[PDB]
Amino acid sequence: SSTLPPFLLDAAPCEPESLEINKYFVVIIYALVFLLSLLGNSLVMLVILYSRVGRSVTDVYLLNLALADLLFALTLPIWAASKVNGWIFGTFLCKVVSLLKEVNFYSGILLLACISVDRYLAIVHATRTLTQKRYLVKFICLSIWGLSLLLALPVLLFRRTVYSSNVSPACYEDMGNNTANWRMLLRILPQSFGFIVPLLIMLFCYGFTLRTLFKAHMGQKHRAMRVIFAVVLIFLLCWLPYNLVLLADTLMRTQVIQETCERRNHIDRALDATEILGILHSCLNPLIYAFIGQKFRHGLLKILAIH
Amino acid sequence: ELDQLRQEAEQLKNQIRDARKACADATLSQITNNIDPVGRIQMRTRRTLRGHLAKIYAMHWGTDSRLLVSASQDGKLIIWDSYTTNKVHAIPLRSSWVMTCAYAPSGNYVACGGLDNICSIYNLKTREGNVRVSRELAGHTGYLSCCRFLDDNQIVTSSGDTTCALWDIETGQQTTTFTGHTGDVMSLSLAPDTRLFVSGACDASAKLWDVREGMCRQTFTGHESDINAICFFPNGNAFATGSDDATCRLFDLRADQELMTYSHDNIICGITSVSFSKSGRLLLAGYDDFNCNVWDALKADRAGVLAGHDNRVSCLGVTDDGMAVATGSWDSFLKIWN
Amino acid sequence: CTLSAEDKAAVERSKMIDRNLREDGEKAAREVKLLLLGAGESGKSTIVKQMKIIVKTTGIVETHFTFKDLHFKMFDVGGQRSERKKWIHCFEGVTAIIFCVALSDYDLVLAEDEEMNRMHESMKLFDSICNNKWFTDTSIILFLNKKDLFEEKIKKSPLTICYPEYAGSNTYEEAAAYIQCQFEDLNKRKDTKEIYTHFTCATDTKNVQFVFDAVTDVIIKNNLKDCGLF
Amino acid sequence: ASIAQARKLVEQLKMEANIDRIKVSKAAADLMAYCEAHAKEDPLLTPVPASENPFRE
Amino acid sequence: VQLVESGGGLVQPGGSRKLSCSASGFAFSSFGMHWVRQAPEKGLEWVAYISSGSGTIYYADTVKGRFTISRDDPKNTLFLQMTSLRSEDTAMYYCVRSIYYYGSSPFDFWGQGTTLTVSSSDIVMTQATSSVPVTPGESVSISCRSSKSLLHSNGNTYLYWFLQRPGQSPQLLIYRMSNLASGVPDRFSGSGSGTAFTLTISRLEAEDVGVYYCMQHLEYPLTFGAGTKLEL
Amino acid sequence: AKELRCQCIKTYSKPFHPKFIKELRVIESGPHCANTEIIVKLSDGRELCLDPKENWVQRVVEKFLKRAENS
Amino acid sequence: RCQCIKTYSKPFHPKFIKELRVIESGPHCANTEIIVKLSDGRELCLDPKENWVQRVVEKFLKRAENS
Ligand SMILES: CC(C)CCC[C@@H](C)[C@H]1CC[C@H]2[C@@H]3CC=C4C[C@@H](O)CC[C@]4(C)[C@H]3CC[C@]12C
Known part of the structure; x- marks a missing residue:
């Protein structure tokens, strides 16, 4: 109801995408992963299936793990195609490719929470409950694949290509006014149930495994502690950075962090950078689980001699 | 004294070692050069029998050339069926250790071997649908090596205390006990008329016995290490043995000496089973370099290696119509080449 | 399915038979097989008299004893007066090799010849087994029994009749730990197997707990190679 | 006693020197005879096609 | 070896009756049993079957569905339970056995046989x-x-x-x-x-x-x- | 392009003139934003957040849009 | 920054409008134009003098002034 020339609060928007162009480089880093997690991941698909006599419990978990990582590798040229450019095509294309990523993100993790509980039975309970892994290794693996389809129903259901200003489009999951305030609960509950339940169940079972192997005295416990200390400290390298930052913006969006534009643009620069730390998990997942042991080191070199 | 008797033996050994040279005017490769080569013989794995969970130690075809027993050391003795892969019987053994098996010429009995030197004889075509122990022929003190059947009442157990025996099955006793070997006998095989049978011991000696009287007729010492496998030519005039000196040596029975050695300078590994094919042209052999060679039996060259096993090859057998050649490996698979 | 009405019931039988093998291989691979070597006079018949739960079988007598939900199987290979080179490959794939050596055999001579003392004889028997080609990845439990007989023989009769260069004291604490370390230097293969020695008495009962403590190591070490860690 | 075993060896070799021997040439000729005269009926030498073979597939 | 059996009596139509075949003398669980009847004026007609281990069960046309068959491997008996029988089901009922492999002898031993009559x-x-x-x-x-x-x-x-x-x-x-x-x-x-x-x-x-x-x-x-x- | 934050956080709510400013931008609370956000910019390069809940703010956005109809 | 002096306009419904951008009398260019993105993602410059093109942005305004 009056006249004034103060206009200097500086609460303007900020939308800078990153310098030293990230969207041109990320598709390169995804390309270097996809062709390398094709030859280095279907190789475990060979050596498990080329013999057909290896059918113990860690011979079929490594089958599905090198499968669910391979099906995770089926979406890498098409997911990289949108990171450079924005989303290219219709609804059904990312109704199913973001379904295909989400089924293999949980099966790519819950198997590391099932190899780990297998490698707790096969070391600590090597006398009494050793029956339990063999008798129901198929039924458990179906119960892990079936569980991942359950949590990947709330991505097929809610998702379609959404558009906005100042950002080339890419698809999200809800319809309405609470579509962020219900995404942030569609995010945090299964992206912890697919992280904090495996990170707890690994570190409660690889602990007891390392309790036993430090007590028992064979010739080569010096190397078995070097792998179980590495399986945790790689799974922690590949999903603790991506699920701390993805925790942090939920604290930013709700109340907890004070929001400036370069703070959030640091977060978006971080979350893109640590999603690269989530995809190199799919690169070296067969390297530490399969190709570290004397079986497939023998198993692959057996086939190159006969072929 | 002792040597003054033994000097007669060595001079008599110098007689029979002289008499064989008196007859070998020309050997087998000198007489069969004007023959054709048999050419390349490649064979394909027509079935595969994948039932056990241990090492296959022996097989024996039935004389109807279809059924097939095979005995593995997890305490199972499966009677297969080679045409369509069906397990006719799984016979649970009393002792888990089984070193051979044999099928009856009538087809009624199978006889497991044993490391506990009790040749137990099973009965198949029985009332009440079981497969039960007919008789257990205790009476050896070694282990047991290869126990072929003469007919349904006479079984010749080789053993591990240098005693090839000859049992009866209605009564449980022996009838003869062919002694004369020094090392323990490792494999035997009967002649097609079942009147003689060879036996290959563990001192590079193959002795030709007879079923009626019970004395050794001839002793062939040509090998260097122990004779690991033996088999007859299909007319009872020759037999080819297998040693751990990687050589298959084809002797005969009427000229008393060694006709040919079958060796190649690339193979070093032992032999575990020899079995002539029908007509006696393809001498097969199963080495333990995981292969399964196919030798020509009238010229010394090789033919198509039947490789395909992921461990040793521990028994062979050609069918009595000469169709297929089942090999039993040390991974649990039998592979019926053809 | 191009089969007759009888042949369709033939391959129902050949799968009912195939079930009762595959539901038996998962009953024989759970249990533990233990080869039991050693000389026939060397206290070999005493260790089988610690716990036993189970005449024609003159060759091999098994012993199906059990302890803490673990069926064991000792195969006493004593009746084989034959050549070891022919039948020892039946016993590859065994879980452990319970060797045995009478500890009082340092000064007792062999029966057939008044030379090659039974300690030096059992060492040559141990070395041929422990460096066999069918036994590389199979560890060796090693019992030393008659240590209720041993310690009174050393204070009244010297040890160095057996061993030419000892240069040590004569107590049971020092001297027996030389024999124990004399044996474990006989394997040319050192980390592919591990010798779990034990000074068992003839009168105690802890040795069956020890043989449980030593197969729970090799079952773990059979699982570390199977799970992929080792 | 031990000579009583070794005496059996010499009379056993008395049996061995009395077996008539064909020459090696004429014994291989019988072996060459049985081989080719039955070679036409051994299915490993002459391979048969999948019609008359009992192992078809 | 014998396959004695019991049951029958005289049942009113539309009713039911359990037929028990206690097969004593052999190892039961490898014998796929059958069931064959003989009407008192007619020949034989096949009625039922059960395979080894109760895996496969076939049936005839004329008793399809309304006759149930079952095996008891430990108690060593054999059961045929008929639901809502007609008058065309009075017969002697045989309890035969058969084992099916290469060179076997199926239908080898036939049981004693029980009557069963209607009104x-x-x-x-x-x-x-x-x-x-x-x-x-x-x-x-x-x-x-x-x-x-x-x-x-x-x-x-x-x-x-x-x-x-x-x-x-x-x-x-x-x-x-x-x-x-x-x-x-x-x-x-x-x-x-x-x-x-x-x-x-x-x-x-x-x-x-x-x-x-x-x-x-x-x-x-x-x-x-x-x-x-x-x-x- | 990863997580669409809304284009506004705070809100200027001190009253001023609707004649004073040049352009207008309106975004509806669709699949990214929890409120409707209004970006208003002069030639002076400054832009402002805007809450439509404020009483005088329902008087500025129509008057300038009425002043849009003056040229 | 004056842009699309073209009168490429299209009379549509306000159920497909998601954002608008009004540009009034400016220093570069004395025109008056409005920019809108359609719900599939487009660029459309409009007519402030054609009435149902002039007034539809007010109905979309009152479609969003309610909250
Ligand atoms: C929409 C698309 C992406 C869904 C794809 C579902 C596929 C990839 C998932 C769902 C069920 C999963 C299967 C579950 C069970 C088995 C059997 C197991 O012995 C091998 C793995 C295997 C075969 C899994 C392979 C992957 C699997 C088939």
């Missing part, structure tokens, strides 16, 4: 002979022509001959074709042609009186023929 695509086997009065000594040949070509693509002609002496339970004579059962004399020898068959007796004694059922086995329902009586 008021398939292959067909013809037997053109009927009631041939014979004398001991003559070589008599019994015909049985079929409808399908019984020879399969693997050499077998699945035609099991039989015999039933009057009053007593039947028994096998000739399994698949010109093979003899365990314990029949060498006088019964068959000869086949695929669609037309013949059972030949070389000499015959007085104990070979009765009827001679040819039964095919090519596909369920396995149909008997109306057998030919032999008399004097």
Whole structure:
């Protein structure tokens, strides 16, 4: 109801995408992963299936793990195609490719929470409950694949290509006014149930495994502690950075962090950078689980001699 | 004294070692050069029998050339069926250790071997649908090596205390006990008329016995290490043995000496089973370099290696119509080449 | 399915038979097989008299004893007066090799010849087994029994009749730990197997707990190679 | 006693020197005879096609 | 070895009755049992079957669904429970056994047989002979022509001959074709042609009186023929 | 392009003139934003957040849009 | 920054409008134009003098002034 020339609060928007162009480089880093997690991941698909006599419990978990990582590798040229450019095509294309990523993100993790509980039975309970892994290794693996389809129903259901200003489009999951305030609960509950339940169940079972192997005295416990200390400290390298930052913006969006534009643009620069730390998990997942042991080191070199 | 008797033996050994040279005017490769080569013989794995969970130690075809027993050391003795892969019987053994098996010429009995030197004889075509122990022929003190059947009442157990025996099955006793070997006998095989049978011991000696009287007729010492496998030519005039000196040596029975050695300078590994094919042209052999060679039996060259096993090859057998050649490996698979 | 009405019931039988093998291989691979070597006079018949739960079988007598939900199987290979080179490959794939050596055999001579003392004889028997080609990845439990007989023989009769260069004291604490370390230097293969020695008495009962403590190591070490860690 | 075993060896070799021997040439000729005269009926030498073979597939 | 059995009595129609076959004498669990009936004026008709370990169960047409069959492996019995029987189901009921592998002898041993009485695509086997009065000594040949070509693509002609002496339970004579059962004399020898068959007796004694059922086995329902009586 | 934050956080709510400013931008609370956000910019390069809940703010956005109809 | 002096306009419904951008009398260019993105993602410059093109942005305004 009056006249004034103060206009200097500086609460303007900020939308800078990153310098030293990230969207041109990320598709390169995804390309270097996809062709390398094709030859280095279907190789475990060979050596498990080329013999057909290896059918113990860690011979079929490594089958599905090198499968669910391979099906995770089926979406890498098409997911990289949108990171450079924005989303290219219709609804059904990312109704199913973001379904295909989400089924293999949980099966790519819950198997590391099932190899780990297998490698707790096969070391600590090597006398009494050793029956339990063999008798129901198929039924458990179906119960892990079936569980991942359950949590990947709330991505097929809610998702379609959404558009906005100042950002080339890419698809999200809800319809309405609470579509962020219900995404942030569609995010945090299964992206912890697919992280904090495996990170707890690994570190409660690889602990007891390392309790036993430090007590028992064979010739080569010096190397078995070097792998179980590495399986945790790689799974922690590949999903603790991506699920701390993805925790942090939920604290930013709700109340907890004070929001400036370069703070959030640091977060978006971080979350893109640590999603690269989530995809190199799919690169070296067969390297530490399969190709570290004397079986497939023998198993692959057996086939190159006969072929 | 002792040597003054033994000097007669060595001079008599110098007689029979002289008499064989008196007859070998020309050997087998000198007489069969004007023959054709048999050419390349490649064979394909027509079935595969994948039932056990241990090492296959022996097989024996039935004389109807279809059924097939095979005995593995997890305490199972499966009677297969080679045409369509069906397990006719799984016979649970009393002792888990089984070193051979044999099928009856009538087809009624199978006889497991044993490391506990009790040749137990099973009965198949029985009332009440079981497969039960007919008789257990205790009476050896070694282990047991290869126990072929003469007919349904006479079984010749080789053993591990240098005693090839000859049992009866209605009564449980022996009838003869062919002694004369020094090392323990490792494999035997009967002649097609079942009147003689060879036996290959563990001192590079193959002795030709007879079923009626019970004395050794001839002793062939040509090998260097122990004779690991033996088999007859299909007319009872020759037999080819297998040693751990990687050589298959084809002797005969009427000229008393060694006709040919079958060796190649690339193979070093032992032999575990020899079995002539029908007509006696393809001498097969199963080495333990995981292969399964196919030798020509009238010229010394090789033919198509039947490789395909992921461990040793521990028994062979050609069918009595000469169709297929089942090999039993040390991974649990039998592979019926053809 | 191009089969007759009888042949369709033939391959129902050949799968009912195939079930009762595959539901038996998962009953024989759970249990533990233990080869039991050693000389026939060397206290070999005493260790089988610690716990036993189970005449024609003159060759091999098994012993199906059990302890803490673990069926064991000792195969006493004593009746084989034959050549070891022919039948020892039946016993590859065994879980452990319970060797045995009478500890009082340092000064007792062999029966057939008044030379090659039974300690030096059992060492040559141990070395041929422990460096066999069918036994590389199979560890060796090693019992030393008659240590209720041993310690009174050393204070009244010297040890160095057996061993030419000892240069040590004569107590049971020092001297027996030389024999124990004399044996474990006989394997040319050192980390592919591990010798779990034990000074068992003839009168105690802890040795069956020890043989449980030593197969729970090799079952773990059979699982570390199977799970992929080792 | 031990000579009583070794005496059996010499009379056993008395049996061995009395077996008539064909020459090696004429014994291989019988072996060459049985081989080719039955070679036409051994299915490993002459391979048969999948019609008359009992192992078809 | 025996398969004694019990049940029956006299049931009112539309009702039910449990038929128990306590098979005592062998190892039960490898024997796929059958159930074959004989109406008091007619021949044999196949009724039921259960495979080894109760895996496979077939049935006839005329009792399809309303007859249930079951096995008891530990208690060593055999159960057929009929629901809402008609008047066309009064018969003697046999409890036969059969084991199926290469070179076996199916339908070998036949049970004692219980009565059961009431109150008021398939292959067909013809037997053109009927009631041939014979004398001991003559070589008599019994015909049985079929409808399908019984020879399969693997050499077998699945035609099991039989015999039933009057009053007593039947028994096998000739399994698949010109093979003899365990314990029949060498006088019964068959000869086949695929669609037309013949059972030949070389000499015959007085104990070979009765009827001679040819039964095919090519596909369920396995149909008997109306057998030919032999008399004097 | 990863997580669409809304284009505004705070809100200027001190009253001023609707004649004073040049352009207008309106975004509806669709699949990214929890409120409707209004970006208003002069030639002076400054832009402002805007809450439509404020009483005088329903008087500025129509008057300038009425002043849009003056040229 | 004056842009699309073209009168490429299209009379549509306000159920497909998601954002608008009004540009009034400016220093570069004395025109008056409005920019809108359609719900599939487009660029459309409009007519402030054609009435149902002039007034539809007010109905979309009152479609969003309610909250
Ligand atoms: C929409 C698309 C992406 C869904 C794809 C579902 C596929 C990839 C998932 C769902 C069920 C999963 C299967 C579950 C069970 C088995 C059987 C197991 O012995 C091998 C793995 C295997 C075969 C899994 C392979 C992957 C699997 C087939």
